[PDB]
Amino acid sequence: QKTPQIQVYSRHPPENGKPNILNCYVTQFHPPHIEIQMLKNGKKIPKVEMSDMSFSKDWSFYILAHTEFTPTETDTYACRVKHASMAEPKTVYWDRD
Amino acid sequence: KNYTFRCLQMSSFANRSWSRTDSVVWLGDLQTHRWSNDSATISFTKPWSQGKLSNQQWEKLQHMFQVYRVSFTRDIQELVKMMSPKEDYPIEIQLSAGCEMYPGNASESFLHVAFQGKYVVRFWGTSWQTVPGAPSWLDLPIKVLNADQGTSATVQMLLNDTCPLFVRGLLEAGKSDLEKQEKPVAWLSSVPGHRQLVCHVSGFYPKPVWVMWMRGDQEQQGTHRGDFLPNADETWYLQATLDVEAGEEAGLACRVKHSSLGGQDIILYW
Amino acid sequence: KTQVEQSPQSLVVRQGENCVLQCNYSVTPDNHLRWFKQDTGKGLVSLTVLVDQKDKTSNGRYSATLDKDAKHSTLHITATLLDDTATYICVVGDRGSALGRLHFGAGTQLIVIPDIQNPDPAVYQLRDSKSSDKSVCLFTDFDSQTNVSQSKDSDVYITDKCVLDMRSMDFKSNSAVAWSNKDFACANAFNNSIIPEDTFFPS
Amino acid sequence: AAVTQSPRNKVAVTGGKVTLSCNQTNNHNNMYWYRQDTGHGLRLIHYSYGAGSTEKGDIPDGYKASRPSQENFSLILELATPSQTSVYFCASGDEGYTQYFGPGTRLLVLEDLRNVTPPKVSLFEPSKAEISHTQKATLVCLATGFYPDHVELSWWVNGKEVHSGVCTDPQPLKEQPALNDSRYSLSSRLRVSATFWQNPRNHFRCQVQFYGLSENDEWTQDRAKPVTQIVSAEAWGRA
Ligand SMILES: CCCCCCCCCCCCCCCCCCCCCCCCCC(=O)N[C@@H](CO[C@H]1O[C@H](CO)[C@H](OCC2CC2)[C@H](O)[C@H]1O)[C@H](O)[C@H](O)CCCCCCCCCCCCCC
Ligand SMILES: *[C@@H]1O[C@H](CO[C@@H]2O[C@@H](C)[C@@H](O)[C@@H](O)[C@@H]2O)[C@@H](O[C@@H]2O[C@H](CO)[C@@H](O[C@@H]3O[C@H](CO)[C@@H](O)[C@H](O[C@H]4O[C@H](CO)[C@@H](O)[C@H](O)[C@@H]4O)[C@@H]3O)[C@H](O)[C@H]2NC(C)=O)[C@H](O)[C@H]1NC(C)=O
Ligand SMILES: *[C@@H]1O[C@H](CO)[C@@H](O[C@@H]2O[C@H](CO)[C@@H](O)[C@H](O)[C@H]2NC(C)=O)[C@H](O)[C@H]1NC(C)=O
Ligand SMILES: *[C@@H]1O[C@H](CO)[C@@H](O)[C@H](O)[C@H]1NC(C)=O
Ligand code: NA
Ligand code: NA
Incomplete structure (x- = not known):
């Protein structure tokens, strides 16, 4: 049982007030049962698209969540992952910097 | 230049009754197919995913896979009963099958099986074999699987002939996306x-x-x-x-x- | 209702005639198909196993075909003999290994009516080896066009007809038996049957 | 590759415990229990992939399986019911698809054992008329007064079983068709050449193996306990 890595990043350069896409890339986990949420200000974003789950040469699983977002001065964005290999859910916040 | 075609199968068996099998297919780093457990048919994720196969060749190939998915599920369940109580649920099985295409009409085909996230079994030549590091109990499954001449003949044809033929056609049909x-x-x-x-x-x-x-x-x-x-x-x-x-x-x-x-x-x- | 269906359910043929038995299945996958012969009260004797997409096999007087595209198999019996009288069962195995399940058809009952060359119908009286004051009546050596009817009186007992085969002599004969403690004589025993006119009644 | 089943025939009472056994000396890992009922193909009850393993088949309800060793696979009816009246087939196999079938076991589960009765057996000697008319000699065997109808009739000449020249009624007939638990009669013929019957060193015996009560079965009636037994009748040839 290996502990999922999480990486949060935007598709386009982040400009306050401009539509964009936020990606959450979860990798190196097993077994493949996993729960991924993308959060705006700690609230679950409704329309989140998931890639099909796949796995790497090392047999470890990965999946890409993404969603439309517009960054601002105030609003925070994060990716929250629940997986049996962790006691508590792990949350990685989108930095931008 | 060189492209690897990868059919990836992920199968979770939670207990005696519950299981799901999901598949994805990759040519290089582009997804060509998806086959959800929820779906009776394989989905194309590109316009050119059928390659140069006629509708009749595709239907026939899909049918073979449909029989395989149902049969695979039951075979694992029966193999668990056969080995009990040595192995128990939950169980994850992964398959990585396909071919690597080289210049000429040269290619190498592969079919690798992982049990609980570890590479233990492949198909090689005309039979299933365990690879170095695999536990000894797998010798009975391998023996049982190798009793099935019919499956051996089908897999040989899939690996030797069908895979390279199909992928050659994919490369042609999908040239503009690949490049x-x-x-x-x-x-x-x-x-x-x-x-x-x-x-x-x-x-x-x-x-x-x-x-x-x-x-x-x-x-x-x-x-x-x-x-x-x-x-x-x-x-x-x-x-x-x-x-x-x-x-x-x-x-x-x-x-x-x-x-x-x-x-x-x-x-x-x- | 089931995944393996056999036709006909039953058939009667005369010795020397050919017959065809059918098996249709919906089993998937269909690795192989076996034909079994089951004598009355006996076990399963394998006749043939078909494995190819368009297969043909033979085993003496038995031959078989398999068409996997149509999911159909026939068993042909050439020049039937008395000993072909049996149930014939079709079985589809869904794997080429022990991971397979067998899917059994319900079977076809074949009866072969034997050929009686030189009929010599007669009704004999047989006495008990020990207590010699009781007896049975044996109606024998009649050909297979003759039908033995049950008794009118219900303290008189009459068996259905039965054919035996003296193999070393290559000779077959039909018989039936009648008895009763009631009065009962062998001249009266088979009155209730349409028996031949030339039937021998000694004494 | 040979498989044996015991018992080959069993009469039992509702609520009784019945055990069917299968032995197999091929060192086959895999063994399988089926029942065969009229109008159906063989149906899988229980199977086993090895010692200590038992698996539910298609129709496991009312049955328990037991695999104490590679060699023996048992089917246990803890509380027998009439619905389990059937013919039971065991099979074994290795990793290949072939299942090697045993000869079958006939089981009758009765509501009650009160009417169970073994046969009387009588042998009827050939007619001199038949002998002179046909140069052949037909012996008749008669089993009467037995219940239920689980009997095996066989012919023995000089202590060896004969099949040639034999035919036995395909089913027993009922002595009182009116009544509910009618007793049965069964007849058989053995036909030989006159000269064979005329040889006084030839000993003929008709034998009926009757399946009835076991040693452990309770018996409250006055008459002799109608146990599984052989009844036979016998005659020597003569000029
Ligand atoms: C491979 C690339 C091909 C190129 C084209 C692909 C392009 C299209 C995209 C594909 C999208 C789907 C991809 C996801 C799937 C990727 C998996 C690739 C591996 C495919 C293996 C196919 C096997 C095909 C045969 C099969 O279904 N066998 C099954 C059915 O067999 C039965 O029916 C057959 C009908 O053909 C035939 O009977 C007919 C008679 C011969 C005439 C057989 O004799 C008969 O036994 C059989 O049950 C088989 O055992 C299934 C499992 C096989 C894989 C086992 C992997 C090893 C696992 C080890 C487990 C150890 C753990 C133990 C606890
Ligand atoms: C498909 O292609 C494989 C080889 O390709 C390899 O495996 C594929 C599944 C795939 O992964 C490829 O990328 C990969 O390169 C063929 O497999 C070979 O099959 C032949 C025969 O069918 C085998 O030859 C045998 O070698 C044995 C030595 O261990 C020997 O015992 C055998 O003897 C037989 O023949 C001789 C006559 O010369 C006779 O004396 C014997 O009595 C017996 O019949 C035989 O020589 C190869 O070893 C296999 N190759 C490997 C590397 O294992 C496969 O046949 C092919 N299938 C089809 C249908 O095309
Ligand atoms: C994955 O797919 C299989 C096959 O479609 C599902 O198994 C079927 O489940 C239904 C209802 O739940 C049953 O009526 C069928 O008998 C099953 N089909 C077969 C071929 O066995 C399976 O439930 C799916 N898994 C999940 C978790 O949804
Ligand atoms: C089997 O696993 C599924 C999925 O986790 C679970 O929901 C279900 O309760 C399990 N069933 C049994 C009978 O244990
Ligand atoms: Na006589
Ligand atoms: Na009769």
């Missing part, structure tokens, strides 16, 4: 008495790229490339970091070379 060029776009940022500069590069295809921090003509050998991360639109994201002393960021630039730019490198000065 696409997508331009990187870059932007800079910093985080934390030291500072970390970050060069963000996003939207490039294909994968090969060059990203370096510079002071004029001098490459900063402290530059650290991260992993290639996917975008949803089948382009790539990558960031290159440079650790520097604060108030030392003057005259640093990020240089990006990629096939899509046709000689016009991207240079961003801090």
Whole structure:
């Protein structure tokens, strides 16, 4: 049982007030049962698209969540992952910097 | 030049009654098929995913896979009963099957099986075999699987003939997608008495790229490339970091070379 | 209702005639198909196993075909003999290994009526080896066009007809038996049957 | 590759415990229990992939399986019911698809044992008329007064079983068709050449193996306990 890595990043350069896409890339986990949420200000974003789950040469699983977002001065964005290999859910916040 | 075609199968068996099998297919780093447990049929994820197969050849190949998925599920369940109580649920099985295409009519086919996330079994020549490191109890499953001459003959034909033929046709049909060029776009940022500069590069295809921090003509050998991360639109994201002393960021630039730019490198000065 | 269906359910043929038995299945996958012969009260004797997409097999007087595209198999019996009288069962195995399940058809009952060359119908009286004051009546050596009817009186007992085969002499004969403690004589025993006119009644 | 089943025939009472056994000396890992009922193909009850393993088949309800060794696979009816009246087939196999079937076991589960009765057996000697008319000699065997109808009739000449020249009624007939638990009669013929019957060193015996009560079965009636037994009748040839 290996502990999922999480990486949060935007598709386009982040400009306050401009539509964009936020990606959450979860990798190196097993077994493949996993729960991924993308959060705006700690609230679950409704329309989140998931890639099909796949796995790497090392047999470890990965999946890409993404969603439309517009960054601002105030609003925070994060990716929250629940997986049996962790006691508590792990949350990685989108930095931008 | 060289493309690997990968059919990936993921099967979870939670207990005696409950299981699901999901598959995805990759040609290089582009997805060509998807086969959800919920679906009776294989889904094309590209216009050219049928390759050069007639509708009759495709139907016949799909049918073979439909029989396989149901049969595979029952066979695992029966193999667990056969080995009980040595092995028990939950159980994960992964298959990686396909071929690597070389110039000429040259190719190498493979079919690798993982049990609880460990490569234990392959198909080689005319039979199933365990690989080095595999536990001894798998010798009984292998013996049982190798009793099935019919499956052996079908797998040999899939691996030797069907895979290379099919993929040759895919490469032809999907040429314009495989050879696409997508331009990187870059932007800079910093985080934390030291500072970390970050060069963000996003939207490039294909994968090969060059990203370096510079002071004029001098490459900063402290530059650290991260992993290639996917975008949803089948382009790539990558960031290159440079650790520097604060108030030392003057005259640093990020240089990006990629096939899509046709000689016009991207240079961003801090 | 089931995944393996056999036709006909039953058939009667005369010795020397050919017959065809059918098996249709919906089993998937269909690795192989076996034909079994089951004598009355006996076990399963394998006749043939078919494995190919368009297969043909033979085993003496038995031959078989398999068409996997149509999911159909026939068993042909050439020049039937008395000993072919049996149930014939079709079985589809869904794997080429022990991971397979067998899917059994309900079977076809074949009866072969034997050829009686030189009929010599007669009704004999047989006495008990020990207590010699009781007896049975044996109606024997009649050809297979003759039908033995049950008794009118219900304290008189009459068996259905039965054919035996003296193999070393290559000779077959039909018989039936009648008895009763009631009065009962062998001249009266088979009155209730349409028996031949030339039937021998000694004494 | 040979498989044996015991018992080959069993009469039991509702609520009784019945055990069917299968032995197999091929060192086959895999063994399988089926029942065969008129109007159906063989149906899988229980199976086993090895010692200590038992698996539910298609129709496992009312049955328990037991695999104490590679060699023996048992089917246990803890509380027998009439619905378990059937013919039971055991099979064994290795990793290949072939299942090697045993000869079958006939089981009758009765509501009650009160009417169970073994046969009387009588042998009827050939007619001299038949002998002179046909140069052949037909012996008749008669089993009467037995319940239920689980009997095996066989012919023995000089202590060896004969099949040639034999035919036995395909089913027993009922002595009182009116009544509910009618007793049965069964007849058989053995036909030989006159000269064979005329040889006084030839000993003929008709034998009926009757399946009835076991040693452990309770018996409250006055008459002799109608146990599984052989009844036979016998005659020597003569000029
Ligand atoms: C491979 C690339 C092909 C190129 C084209 C692909 C392009 C299309 C995209 C594909 C999208 C789907 C991809 C996801 C799937 C990727 C998996 C690739 C491996 C495929 C293996 C196919 C096997 C096909 C045969 C099969 O279904 N066998 C099954 C059915 O067999 C039965 O029916 C057959 C009908 O053909 C035939 O009877 C007919 C008679 C011969 C005439 C057979 O004799 C008969 O036994 C059989 O049950 C088989 O055992 C299934 C499992 C096989 C894989 C086992 C992997 C090893 C696992 C080890 C487990 C250890 C753990 C233990 C606890
Ligand atoms: C498909 O292709 C494989 C080989 O390709 C390899 O495996 C594929 C599944 C795939 O992964 C490829 O990328 C990969 O390169 C063929 O496998 C070979 O099959 C032949 C025969 O069918 C085998 O030859 C045998 O070698 C044995 C030595 O261990 C020997 O015992 C055998 O003897 C037989 O023949 C001789 C006569 O010369 C006779 O004396 C014997 O009595 C007996 O019949 C035989 O020589 C190869 O070893 C296999 N190769 C490997 C590497 O295992 C496969 O046949 C092919 N199938 C089809 C249908 O095309
Ligand atoms: C994955 O797919 C299989 C096959 O479609 C599902 O198994 C079927 O489940 C239904 C109802 O739950 C049953 O009526 C069928 O008998 C099953 N089909 C077969 C071929 O066995 C399975 O439930 C799916 N798994 C999940 C978790 O949804
Ligand atoms: C089997 O696993 C599923 C999925 O986790 C679970 O929901 C279900 O309750 C399990 N069933 C049994 C009978 O244990
Ligand atoms: Na006589
Ligand atoms: Na009769």
